[PDB]
Structure 1
Amino acid sequence: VNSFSGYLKLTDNVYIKNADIVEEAKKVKPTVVVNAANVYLKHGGGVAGALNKATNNAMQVESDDYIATNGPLKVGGSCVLSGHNLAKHCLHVVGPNVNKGEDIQLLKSAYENFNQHEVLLAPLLSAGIFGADPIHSLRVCVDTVRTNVYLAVFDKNLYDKLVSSFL
Structure 2
Amino acid sequence: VNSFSGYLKLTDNVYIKNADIVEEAKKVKPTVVVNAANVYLKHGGGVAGALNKATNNAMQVESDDYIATNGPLKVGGSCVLSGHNLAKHCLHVVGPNVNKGEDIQLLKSAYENFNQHEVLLAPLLSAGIFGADPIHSLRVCVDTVRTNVYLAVFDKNLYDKLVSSFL
Gaps of 5+ in 1: none
Q: State the TM-score, normalizing by the size of structure 2.
A: 1.00
Report how far residue 39 of structure 1 moved. 0.1
Deviations 1:109-167 (CA, angstroms, capped at 9, x unpaired):
00000000000000000001000000000000000000000000000000000000000
The aligned runs of 1:142-157 (5 Å cut-off) are: 142-157=142-157
SS at match of 1:91: strand
Alignment partners' CA distance in 2, 1:71 and 1:112: 21
Q: Unaligned 5+ residue runs, structure 2?
A: none
1:94 Cα offset (Å):
0.0
Q: Distance in 1 between matches of 2:76 and 2:130?
A: 13
Q: Distance in 2 between matches of 1:21 and 1:12?
A: 22
Segments of 4+ moved more than 6 angstroms: none
State how many pairs are aligned: 167
1:104 to partner: Cα distance = 0.0
Q: 2 CA distance for matches of 1:39 and 1:141?
A: 20
Deviations 1:20-40 (A, max 9, x none): 000000000000000000000
Q: CA deviation digits over 1:9-50, x for unaligned, max 9?
A: 000000000000000000000000000000000000000000
Render the CA deviation track for 1:78-128: whole Å, top value 9, x for unaligned: 000000000000000000000000000000000000000000000000001
Q: Which residue of 2 aligns with 1:133?
A: 133
SS in 2 for 1:104: coil
Q: Name 2:19's counterpart in structure 1.
A: 19
Q: Work out the CA distance in 2 between the residues paired with 1:21 and 1:52.
A: 11
Q: Partners of 1:18 and 1:142 in 2: how far apart?
A: 17
Identity %: 100
Measure, in 1, the Cα distance between the counterparts of 2:15 and 2:21.
Answer: 14
Q: Deviations over 1:56-76 (max 9, x none)?
A: 000000000000000000000
- SS of the equivalent of 1:15 reads strand
Work out the CA distance in 1 between the residues paired with 2:89 and 2:21. 14
Counterpart Cα distance in 2 of 1:28 and 1:128: 24
How many angstroms apart in 2 are the aligned matches of 1:153 and 1:34? 13
Q: For 2:64, what is the secondary structure of its paired residue?
A: helix
| Distance in 1 separating the partners of 2:79 and 2:137 | 20
Q: Tell me the TM-score normalized by structure 1.
A: 1.00
